[PDB]
Every structure is written in C-alpha cells, then in structure tokens.
Amino acid sequence: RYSFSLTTFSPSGKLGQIDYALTAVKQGVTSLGIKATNGVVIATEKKSSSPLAMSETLSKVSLLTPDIGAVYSGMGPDYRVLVDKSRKVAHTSYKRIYGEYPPTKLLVSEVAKIMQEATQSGGVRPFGVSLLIAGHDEFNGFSLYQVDPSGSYFPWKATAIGKGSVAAKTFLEKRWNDELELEDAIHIALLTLKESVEGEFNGDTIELAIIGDENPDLLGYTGIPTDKGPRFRKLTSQEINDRLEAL
Amino acid sequence: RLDRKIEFPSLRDRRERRLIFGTIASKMSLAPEADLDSLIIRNDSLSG
Amino acid sequence: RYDSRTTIFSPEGRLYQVEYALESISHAGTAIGIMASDGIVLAAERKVTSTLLEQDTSTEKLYKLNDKIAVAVAGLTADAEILINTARIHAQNYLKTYNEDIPVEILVRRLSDIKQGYTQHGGLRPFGVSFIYAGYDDRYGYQLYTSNPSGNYTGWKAISVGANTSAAQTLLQMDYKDDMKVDDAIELALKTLSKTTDSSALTYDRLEFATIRKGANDGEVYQKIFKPQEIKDILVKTGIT
Amino acid sequence: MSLPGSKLEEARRLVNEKQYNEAEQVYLSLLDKDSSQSSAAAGASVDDKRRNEQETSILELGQLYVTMGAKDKLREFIPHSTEYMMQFAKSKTVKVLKTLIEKFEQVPDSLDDQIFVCEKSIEFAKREKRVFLKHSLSIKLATLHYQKKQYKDSLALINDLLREFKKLDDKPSLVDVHLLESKVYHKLRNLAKSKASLTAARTAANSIYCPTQTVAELDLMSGILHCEDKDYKTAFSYFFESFESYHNLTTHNSYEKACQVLKYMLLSKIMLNLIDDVKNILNAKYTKET
Amino acid sequence: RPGRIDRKIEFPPPSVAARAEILRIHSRKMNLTRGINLRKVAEKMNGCSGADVKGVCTEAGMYALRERRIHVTQEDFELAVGKVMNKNQETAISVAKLFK
Amino acid sequence: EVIELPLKNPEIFQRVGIKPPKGVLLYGPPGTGKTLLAKAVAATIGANFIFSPASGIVDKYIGESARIIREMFAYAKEHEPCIIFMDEVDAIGGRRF
Amino acid sequence: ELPLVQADLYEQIGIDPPRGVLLYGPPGTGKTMLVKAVANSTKAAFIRVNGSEFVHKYLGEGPRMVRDVFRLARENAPSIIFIDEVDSIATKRFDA
Amino acid sequence: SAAGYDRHITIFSPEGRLYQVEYAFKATNQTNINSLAVRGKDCTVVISQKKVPDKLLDPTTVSYIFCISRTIGMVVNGPIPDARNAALRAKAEAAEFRYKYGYDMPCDVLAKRMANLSQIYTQRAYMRPLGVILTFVSVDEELGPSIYKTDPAGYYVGYKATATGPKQQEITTNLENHFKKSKIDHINEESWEKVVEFAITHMIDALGTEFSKNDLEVGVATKDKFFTLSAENIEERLVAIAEQ
Ligand SMILES: Nc1ncnc2c1ncn2[C@@H]1O[C@H](COP(=O)(O)OP(=O)(O)O)[C@@H](O)[C@H]1O
Ligand SMILES: Nc1ncnc2c1ncn2[C@@H]1O[C@H](COP(=O)(O)OP(=O)(O)O)[C@@H](O)[C@H]1O
Ligand SMILES: [Mg+2]
Numbered sequence A: 001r002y003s004f005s006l007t008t009f010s011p012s013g014k015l016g017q018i019d020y021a022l023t024a025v026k027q028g029v030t031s032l033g034i035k036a037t038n039g040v041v042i043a044t045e046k047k048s049s050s051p052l053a054m055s056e057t058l059s060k061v062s063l064l065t066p067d068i069g070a071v072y073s074g075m076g077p078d079y080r081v082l083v084d085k086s087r088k089v090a091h092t093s094y095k096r097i098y099g100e101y102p103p104t105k106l107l108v109s110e111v112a113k114i115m116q117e118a119t120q121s122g123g124v125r126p127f128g129v130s131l132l133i134a135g136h137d138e139f140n141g142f143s144l145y146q147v148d149p150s151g152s153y154f155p156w157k158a159t160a161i162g163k164g165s166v167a168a169k170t171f172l173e174k175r176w177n178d179e180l181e182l183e184d185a186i187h188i189a190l191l192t193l194k195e196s197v198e199g200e201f202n203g204d205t206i207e208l209a210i211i212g213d214e215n216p217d218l219l220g221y222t223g224i225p226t227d228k229g230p231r232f233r234k235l236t237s238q239e240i241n242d243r244l245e246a247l
Numbered sequence B: 001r002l003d004r005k006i007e008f009p010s011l012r013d014r015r016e017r018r019l020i021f022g023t024i025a026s027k028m029s030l031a032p033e034a035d036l037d038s039l040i041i042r043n044d045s046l047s048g
Numbered sequence C: 001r002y003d004s005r006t007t008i009f010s011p012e013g014r015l016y017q018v019e020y021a022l023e024s025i026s027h028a029g030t031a032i033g034i035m036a037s038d039g040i041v042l043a044a045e046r047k048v049t050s051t052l053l054e055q056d057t058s059t060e061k062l063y064k065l066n067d068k069i070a071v072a073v074a075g076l077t078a079d080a081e082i083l084i085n086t087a088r089i090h091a092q093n094y095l096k097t098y099n100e101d102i103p104v105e106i107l108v109r110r111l112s113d114i115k116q117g118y119t120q121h122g123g124l125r126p127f128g129v130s131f132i133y134a135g136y137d138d139r140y141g142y143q144l145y146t147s148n149p150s151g152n153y154t155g156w157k158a159i160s161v162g163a164n165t166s167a168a169q170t171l172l173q174m175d176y177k178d179d180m181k182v183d184d185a186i187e188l189a190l191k192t193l194s195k196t197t198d199s200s201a202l203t204y205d206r207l208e209f210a211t212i213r214k215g216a217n218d219g220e221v222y223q224k225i226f227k228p229q230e231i232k233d234i235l236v237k238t239g240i241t
Numbered sequence D: 001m002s003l004p005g006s007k008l009e010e011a012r013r014l015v016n017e018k019q020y021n022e023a024e025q026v027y028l029s030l031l032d033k034d035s036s037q038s039s040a041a042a043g044a045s046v047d048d049k050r051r052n053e054q055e056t057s058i059l060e061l062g063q064l065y066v067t068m069g070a071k072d073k074l075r076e077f078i079p080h081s082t083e084y085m086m087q088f089a090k091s092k093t094v095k096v097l098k099t100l101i102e103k104f105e106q107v108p109d110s111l112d113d114q115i116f117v118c119e120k121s122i123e124f125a126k127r128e129k130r131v132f133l134k135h136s137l138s139i140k141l142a143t144l145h146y147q148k149k150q151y152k153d154s155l156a157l158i159n160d161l162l163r164e165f166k167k168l169d170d171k172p173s174l175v176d177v178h179l180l181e182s183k184v185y186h187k188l189r190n191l192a193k194s195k196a197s198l199t200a201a202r203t204a205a206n207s208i209y210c211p212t213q214t215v216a217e218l219d220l221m222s223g224i225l226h227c228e229d230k231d232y233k234t235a236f237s238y239f240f241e242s243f244e245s246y247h248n249l250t251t252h253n254s255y256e257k258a259c260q261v262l263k264y265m266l267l268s269k270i271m272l273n274l275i276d277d278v279k280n281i282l283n284a285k286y287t288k289e290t
Numbered sequence E: 001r002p003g004r005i006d007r008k009i010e011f012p013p014p015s016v017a018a019r020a021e022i023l024r025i026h027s028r029k030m031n032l033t034r035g036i037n038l039r040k041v042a043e044k045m046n047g048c049s050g051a052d053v054k055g056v057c058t059e060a061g062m063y064a065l066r067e068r069r070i071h072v073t074q075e076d077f078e079l080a081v082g083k084v085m086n087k088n089q090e091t092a093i094s095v096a097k098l099f100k
Numbered sequence F: 001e002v003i004e005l006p007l008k009n010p011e012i013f014q015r016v017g018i019k020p021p022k023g024v025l026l027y028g029p030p031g032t033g034k035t036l037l038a039k040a041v042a043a044t045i046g047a048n049f050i051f052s053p054a055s056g057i058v059d060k061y062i063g064e065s066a067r068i069i070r071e072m073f074a075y076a077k078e079h080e081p082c083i084i085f086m087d088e089v090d091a092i093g094g095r096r097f
Numbered sequence G: 001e002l003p004l005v006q007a008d009l010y011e012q013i014g015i016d017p018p019r020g021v022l023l024y025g026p027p028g029t030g031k032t033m034l035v036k037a038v039a040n041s042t043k044a045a046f047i048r049v050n051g052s053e054f055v056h057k058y059l060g061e062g063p064r065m066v067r068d069v070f071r072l073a074r075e076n077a078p079s080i081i082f083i084d085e086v087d088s089i090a091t092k093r094f095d096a
Numbered sequence H: 001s002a003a004g005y006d007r008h009i010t011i012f013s014p015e016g017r018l019y020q021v022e023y024a025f026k027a028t029n030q031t032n033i034n035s036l037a038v039r040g041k042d043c044t045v046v047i048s049q050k051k052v053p054d055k056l057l058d059p060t061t062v063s064y065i066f067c068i069s070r071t072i073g074m075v076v077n078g079p080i081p082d083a084r085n086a087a088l089r090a091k092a093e094a095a096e097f098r099y100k101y102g103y104d105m106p107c108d109v110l111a112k113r114m115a116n117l118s119q120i121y122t123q124r125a126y127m128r129p130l131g132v133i134l135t136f137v138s139v140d141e142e143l144g145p146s147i148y149k150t151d152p153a154g155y156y157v158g159y160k161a162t163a164t165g166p167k168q169q170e171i172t173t174n175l176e177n178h179f180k181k182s183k184i185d186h187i188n189e190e191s192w193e194k195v196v197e198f199a200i201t202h203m204i205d206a207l208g209t210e211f212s213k214n215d216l217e218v219g220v221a222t223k224d225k226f227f228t229l230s231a232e233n234i235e236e237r238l239v240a241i242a243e244q
C-alpha cells in the first residue's frame, strides 16, 4: 500500500516513487564519467531501433552552459524538458547575479532542486532520468556529480549509471588512477563502454565529449583575452575514430 | 548449508565463447568454408 | 489502514505516517552532537562509501545555517536540502531585521513549525529529517537541541539521532560527565562511533566533524568544520587507526 | 644540456655506419661529464631545481650503458649501475634504476655477471632509500635465478615478498609474484602448488582488468598446467587467448613468447588426433608469416 | 502471549573470545593449524554466526583436499576466511551506491 | 520444411549434425482451420493420422491416462511415417501459479 | 562426485565433507546442462524436482510434497536432490 | 499487469515504465492508415492513405495531412481528436515563434517544442498524453529537407524516411533495402514530381495493393512552401506510373 502515493512512507521508511524511479534509470543507456586532474570525460552510447533514423538528431550529450555539459540514462522524454528547465534556471538564478554562467557546484544544486519539486507535489511524478553533470569552475577545479531523480546529489570521482553500470563500475574501480591526462582518460572511457557492446561499436554511434581546458576556436570573438572560451567541447565521430584506432 | 558457491560468466571472454562454438566441431566435422572465429568477435552478451 | 492520509488519526490517536516518517531517520547514518561546557562538537557518520566516491573534498551533513548555528544531518538528503535552505534564510532574515544574529531557541522553533505544517495541513508528505542543532547565543550560552520529524524539539546535553540511535545513546551516557571537556568530548564521539557503525575500518573517509566553541579566541565565537586531513590526524590520537 | 644530449646521439650513429672505436671514445667522455652533473655543481648543476640539464643526464644513462649488445663494453658498464643511486637519490632515480637493470638482461648477457649487481643495488635501496625500489628488484632477481636454473633461491625471495603483501592488500605487485611462484613449482613437478598459486594470482588480481601483458603471461601458465592434467580443450583455449594478446601487442621480447604459445596450440590437437584443427591453425596467417 | 512461553533465551552473534573456542574444537577433529595460529585468524575476521566459524574450517580443510596433504597451515586458514566474506557482500552492495 | 524434409532424408540433417527439427505449435483464433491443415501436411507425405482428443476420456488422474498415452506412441512407430496430432494439449497443461 | 569416489579421503583429513551447491548465473549459462551430466557419471540415485511441480493443489498441500521428497532421498540414500527452480520458492519478504 | 497504475501516468510501475503511456503507442493503429515520407534533394514528400468507406463522406474533408504554417506540414496517425488538438498547438506555436524570434520556424524547433509539450502532458495527472504520432515535414531555411517524427510520449528523432501505421514494419523493411543498395541517404531525383512518383511506387509495393486517386492524399514540401494536392493533380502522377 505504501508504494503508490508519494505521501505514504513504508513502515521501513523511504518513499516508493523514488525507488521505482531509480528502477527506470537503470533501464536506460550506459553512460559513464571519469574525473581527471585536467579534465573530465563524459561518455554514452546511442541507438534508435531503426537505421533510417539519423543519429545527430538525437543528442544525449548536451552542453548545459558553455563550461558545463551533461548526459543521462533513463527515459528519453524526461531529459529534454529538464535540460530546458535547467538552462532557464541557470540564467534566472545566476547569469543575472554573476552576469555569466554559474560554477559547477552551484548549478548541481539548482537542477537537484527541480527534482525535489517533482517529488514534493503529489499527482506530479518524478523525472525518469539520472543525470551526470560535469563542469569546471575557477575555484574548485574540474568536477563531476550525479543528480538522482530523488532530489539528492552525490559528488563522484568516477561513476557509471544505466544498464551496464554494475560491470562498468568494477572495471572503473580497478583501472582508475588519481592523476591521469585528458587523453588517457578518453582511452579508459571508450574501452569501458566497449564492455557494454561489441561488433556495433564505432565512433559514429558513440557520443563522447569532454570538459577540458579553454578552446579559443569556439569562443567566436577575439581580441578580449580576459574571458575564456568554452571548456566544453563535443568530439566528432572522426576524432573518436582516431582514438579508437590508436587502441 | 551451503558450502560451495559456483559463479558462471555470461558475457563470456573470447576464450569461453570459443569453446561452446567448438562443440559444433566435436559433434560433427565442418566445412573449410566455415570460420568460427568470425562469431566470437560480433558477440557481446551471448550465453550458451 | 490509517496510513492513507497524513491528516487522519487512528483509533488509538497514533498516526502511522508520523511513526513511519520517524523510522526513516534510522535508515540513514549516525549523527551525534555532544554538548560540553567548553564547546559543542558535532560528529556524523556517512551512509555511502566506495573507492570512486569522492568524500575527501566535501561535507554533505554539516551545514552552517548562519554564523553561529549549524546542523548535522540525518534522514533523507532530499528532504534535507529544502529545509536547510529555508532554515538558513530565516536565521539570516533575523540578522537583517534586528541587526543581531538569531538566538538558538527561536530558529529551532521556527523550523519545527515548518515540519509540523506538512503533517497538519495539505495532502503532502511530512518531512523526514532530524537535524541536530548546535548554536551559541548569549542568553543561555551553549545550546543543544535536535528536532523530531514530528516537529518538536527538546534540549539536550548529548543526543544522538540517525542510525543505531538506542545503542549510541547508551554509550554516550556511560562515559559522559557534567564537568567534562571539549577535548574529552571529541574523543567521546570517536569512541561511540567505532561501536555503532557496521564498518570496522572507520577511517577518515566515513567521518564528518565540526566543533563550535567560544573558547576559540576570546569574546568571539568560531564554527569550524574540520577539513579531511585534520579528521585523520585525530583518529591516531584516539587510537582507532 | 645541448652538448651531452647531442653527444649521446653522435655516439649512436658512429656504431652503425662507422668504426666502433670512435663510438666507445664518445661514451667515455660522456661518463665523466655526467658524473659531475649527477653529484651537483651549483645544487643541481644549473642552479635551483633539476631543470632540463640534470633530467637530460639520467635519461641518456640507459643508452650509455646498454645500446649495445654483447661486447666487453657492455660487461664493463654493469657494476656501475649500482653507484648512481647514491649519487643522485632523487624520487625518479628509482624508476630509471628499474629500467636500467631490466635492460642489461634483455640484450645478450651472461646471467652470473648481472646477479651481483642486483644484490648490491637491493642493499642500496633497503639501507635508507625506499622500500618501493627494494620490492621490484627482488621480483626481477628471483626470475633471473629461475632462468639460471636455481629454484631454491627464487623461492626464498618469494616468501619475503608474500608476507609483506599479506600486510598490504591493494598491491598488483603480488600478482606478478604469485604468477612467478607457479613457474618455479612447474619445474619441481609440484603441480599442486602450481595450482595453489595460480588461483592465488586470480584472487589477488581483479579479473584480467590488470595490464594486458600480465594477462598474456597468466593465461599461458593455466595453459601448461591443464595440458599436464590431460585436458586439451581447456589447454588450447587459454593458449589461443594468450597468443592473441602477444600478437596484437607490439613485441619487444614478446616475439619469443608468442612462439612458445604457437607451438603448444598445435601440440594439443596432435594429442587428440584431430588433424583438422592442426591445419586450421597452420596457413600463413601468422604461422609462416610474422 | 505471554504466559506460555514467557522465558526467553537470546543466542547472540559471537564475540572473538567466543569464536576462538569454536575454531579450536573443529580443528581437534581435523588436523591442527601448523604454528597454532587458529586463535590468530579469529581476530582477523569475526564471524556473524556460529555456522560462519564452521564455514572457515570446512573451506580451509578443502584446500588440503585439493593438494591432498595431511596437514593444514595458517595460509589455508587465511584464504578460507575470505570465502565467508563474499556472502555478506552479495547480500548488500547497493546500499553504498544509489542510497538516499 | 519442418516435417517433410527430415522424414524423407534424415540423411542431410545427419551430415550437418544439427538435430532434425520437430515440434510445431499451431495457434491462431478459432476457425483458422489449422486442424484441416494438419491433414493437408500429412496428405502430401501420405502419412498416417492420429487425431487424439484428451477430454471425455482423460481427467486429472494419471492412472487411466497413461494407458491411453502409451498406445498412441506405439501405433505411430509401427505405421511410420505417421504424424501424431496432439489435440487438447492445453487441457493437460497447467502453470506454476 | 568425489565424496562418492573417495570417502576415505575426507575422513583422512577429518574435514566435514561439502554439502549444498548453489549453482548460479544469469539465464542461458548452462546450469541445467551441467547437472544433467552429474546424473550419468555419479552411478548412484537421482532425484530431480522442479519449482513448477512444488505448488499448492490444495491449502497446505505444498509442505506435504517436501517431506515425501527428502524421505525418499533417504530411502534410496546415497542420492543427489536437485531442484531446478528455487527462484519462486525463496523470496526474502512479503507484504501479504 | 495491473493493480494501480495503468490508471495513472504519474505513478510508476515496478518495471519503471508507465503502462498508460505505452497504451498511447497501441492507440495509434486506431484508424488503420499508413504514412510514408521520404527525402529528395530539395523537397520532402509525405503520403498517407484515405479511407472513405461510405459515399456519404466527402473525400475532401477526409484528410490527416495538415497545413500547419507556411513551410510546415504534418501527417497524423491515430485518432482525430488528439490530431486536431496537436495540429492546433502546432499552428499556434509556429505563429508565436515568429513574432518572438522573427523568421519562419524550422521543422526541428517545432518538433522539439511539441515533443516537450507531450512530455508535460505525461508529467501532470490532470492531462493525459496525446494519442497521435505526428510526422512533421518541411524543407528548412538552412538544413534543407527534413522529416521529424515526434511520438506521443515526447520522444523525437529525425529520419531519412519514415513510415507509421499498423503495416509500418513492411514499409520500413522496404525502405532499408532501398536506401542500403543505393549507398546514399537521399533520393537523387531533382524535381519534386519524380520524387512523388517514387513514393507512390514504394507504398504500392510494400503494402501490396493498388491504390486510387480517391485513396491517397499527398502533401509536398518544396523550399519556402507547402501544399496539399487535390485528387485531380494526384491523378497526373498516377497516370505517369501506370504507363511509364
Ligand atoms: N483454408 C480453408 N479452406 C476451406 N475450409 C476451411 C479453411 N479454413 C477453415 N475452413 C473451415 O472451417 C471449419 C473448422 O475448422 P477446424 O479445422 O475444425 O478448426 P479450429 O481448431 O481452428 O477451430 C473447417 O472444417 C472448414 O469447413
Ligand atoms: N557449456 C555449454 N556447452 C554447450 N551448450 C551449452 C553450454 N552451456 C549452455 N549451453 C546451451 O544452453 C542451453 C540452455 O541452457 P540451460 O542449461 O537450460 O540454462 P539456465 O538454467 O542457465 O537458464 C543448453 O540446452 C545448451 O544447449
Ligand atoms: Mg482443432
């Protein structure tokens, strides 16, 4: 009986709607994040269950702000709204209070806060997804965080989520080092993900992006050296191929 | 109870995929046109 | 039964929802406040762990609400997030209005009222958070409270909420003294924690700490969340490591 | 910096397209200059930290001592591997000293000459440097003794190591030891303790998520043991995986060990008398090619 | 209810001081530990039952079965504790990841 | 393809070594005429026909029922090629529940 | 199989000989297969039961069935009792 | 199974997927029509069947293909009620984007705002999800021919060609074989007309039935424009097929 409100607790505690939401997450695609000391690499694989469907149309790697991207595992529809609501809160709360994009630590709290509301009301369901959010800021360095449909956030050095989580997680535990390059971290990433699938593994269907060091290329304006380009950069298929060939 | 706990792989290394494909050869002689090794690559989650 | 709303009562005048919400707090990690007459120490145990969990750069159950009162967290973290933010705003709102910082007794009362409201009114969950409050205000000196998720509060000289509540409380009152010392108090939290926890390592990665003292400087009040490398250092001295 | 680094390079060229006497003469000049540098002449020979000059000198030491091949020049250099660790005593000299010692064994060398040097250097590590330097080289040494057909000496060193790593529980260094323990025991015809420490290898590693090379060596060792138990389906399957790991890795001494494995594959199917599978394996795909 | 049956006997999780004796008697039937380290292993892992204490010895003397030796040793006893821990791990692992 | 091929020659299935394949579950809304198709398949082979009902002669007991079952099997083996059509196989099924 | 083949070996050590054997893995791993093999080479009695066959046909019929099966094992002892499915039978808890 | 929560889209299953949201994917075969859209090299063609079972209906009001805004089409599969509401929303959205942001709304931005709107309908309990698959077609100002299929869950994904309906799978395989053998992702025909002819050919093949000029409705996107063709313009294309 305690399952089906959000209002009913079990005798043992906890709410079911949060528990069942976590079940949902784990059905979604295999996505993983590794924190490095000069980057963060965030990676997922993609499908469409029909080759007719194009694969750029989907985006499962989205820059949230120019310095902070995110992925998911879980239900597709829920991601797309929640990223819209997050960009929109990012401006309200912090791009009018700093006049630029918020630090990573801040924005984790704000997105986690929309989850908290989608549990608080009854007759409104949680969101179906768990995010990884990785970004970089000027005071806490490079960073990685997990934001659960619970409305709780957890800081992570490395984690994985989704269908291949349990296997990916033990591979990460062993293979991670405390000091890795951005470049080495990409190789641990492609490889980890290749556990989840083989023979249909190619750079076309694998989306893999980074938050590294500034790029002056995607800044789009030049002559003002007192602002930094996007820390986020999305890598293309052909570039992922260079790294997959090099393995 | 309950002394011996036996684990099975189910993702399977190439080493274990090969053995169950190798059951075909034991069972009956097969064509030089056949290549078993082709099948070990394409697998990713395939039990016996 | 009389689970089905939170605005009902039962044939015995219990409410299953208040009991169930209470048991939620014994699902989440130990949290201990021990008051001594030379400081209050807050110590808490984590409820999550693994070699790739980061927990060596971060606190997540020690929050300074304002600048002279802080809380330890026990219960759900989601439930916790909203009420910590509300509590910090009201503590600090007082600051603005009256241009002196909030007293301990008023801020706990306020937040208990908010708690109670979710049971009393609407079709909402009660909030399953037990906050240990440690403050200083110059009216009663050092003050220790904890608030129930039922939404009421009682003062304390030592208390333990969070997992293994019963065991911890027994442990604390065997070796406690009224004279005490702040340094003996730190050692006491560390003593209790070894036993209560189900992890036999009990190393820095599992441990949070903050001590609030007015013996820190003189005429001044200092809230110090310790950093991870101090938490390690004190584990040798009590000999657990 | 410029002159020792350019000189190092100038020496190498005179071996391969010029007379060997002029090469030997530039190596001798270099010893003298580098030694002054190692033992400091400004606090790092260049003032303040090591900078480029001092770190250029330690790196070029592995091409001074052993380009080289079996010559008498190569013998002469080997005792003097031990001395530099005292002369430096940096945190990265530890790393270079492991690279240097291993290098003399890889090119042609008499085994006897090399032992002495390794026992002397283990003493310099465990006297006052670092334990970390001590462990590696005792592993290397027991292997060297195993190849010289002394198996008593190899075990004695394994036992020290085994007990210090029942105190420590993360160390992957204890997979290499365990692995090695089994090879010693194969030759004693203790095929019990070959198993005992083959199992211990899997437990102290985390699957085969350990470096791909060590997995080659570990798969190879299962391979021998089951072949002796008269299971030739299990022996063939391990040996193929290990071949694959050697073959796809870029050989440096792994060309040697891939040949050992290629033989055994065939060996197995000879025993059953499946002539089919002997010639499935032999084409020219890598059997008569690389 | 509670007249029936109103005496109660609790049989607790064993202490290390209790566990040493449980190892001792199971080894007296078997072949003793060499260097007599049977008390020493008790401290390294405490069981959570009396039958977990039993579970070490059976696993330990199993190793002696593989090799077909007539003794048991400390090293056999140590490997054996680790089998018993696998079980506590299999039951609860998700309470450290994706909890609250 | 299922029935007719291995019956004429078990001989090809034996070369490959993969088992000659048997067991076909016929399904579809009633009145499909799949019992009529049972006849048409075996009409080509000229195979003998055993239509068994299993109600009115069969209950919950396995006493009586085993006598009935043993006979059908024996008649087809003698009268081979024969196809045994097991009808009402769903009256003698059951589930875990 | 080994307790059957060399009982003396257990006695010598004075080791309490093994008992239950959980076999486990995800499905299609080959568990049923392995235990089919055990039954030929044991050269001894064999009892295989299912969890679809351990049901209640009546109220309190379920437990009657267990007691018959483990008495029967003793009658024909030594014998190996195999239950294919104990995944429906064993469940940690209920709200029922 | 059942118990709660095929009665609610705000209450999860022990599966983790909402059973009533899955029923909207079983409510899409209700009117028993099939759609095909393919991409040309400056046009998009979309064709869905027309059922006029009785002579009482006028085949000119029986359609599922709609003009959404100047450059934007849509074909709907599933029931008429959710079809109108979706179509309206889309008409309103297209119109709004322009006063806010200036120029003609791309196929992609329309599809994405309707997908986000579908997801909201499932978020709240006081609104149910829609019961239609929407297949939008446009030729884009800067990306050219584009097909975006937005499903009633709030999932949206693009296409090279797509098909929808109860006989979908047959058209889908038909299309896989075709685009795979050519080794391209487009049809290489350079007029809108010979792309409409090819589409006719392929729906006839896949379903396996000859259709008539009273059983097709065809909407054609060219760049900057959208039109729905009448029955007598549709015949020109048919007689082109019928003797080549
Ligand atoms: N393909 C067909 N050709 C001719 N008659 C048919 C055909 N299919 C069905 N029928 C008719 O339907 C009757 C009933 O089918 P029957 O084989 O008794 O069916 P089921 O087991 O599906 O109920 C047949 O006897 C025959 O008259
Ligand atoms: N080691 C193996 N050799 C050959 N076939 C195998 C092997 N393992 C499993 N299989 C095949 O898988 C089939 C199904 O496995 P089964 O034992 O019924 O599985 P589970 O109980 O794990 O679901 C077996 O009938 C067999 O054909
Ligand atoms: Mg019939």
Ligand SMILES: [Mg+2]
Pocket (backbone or CB within 6 Å): G031, G032, G084
């Ligand atoms: Mg099974």
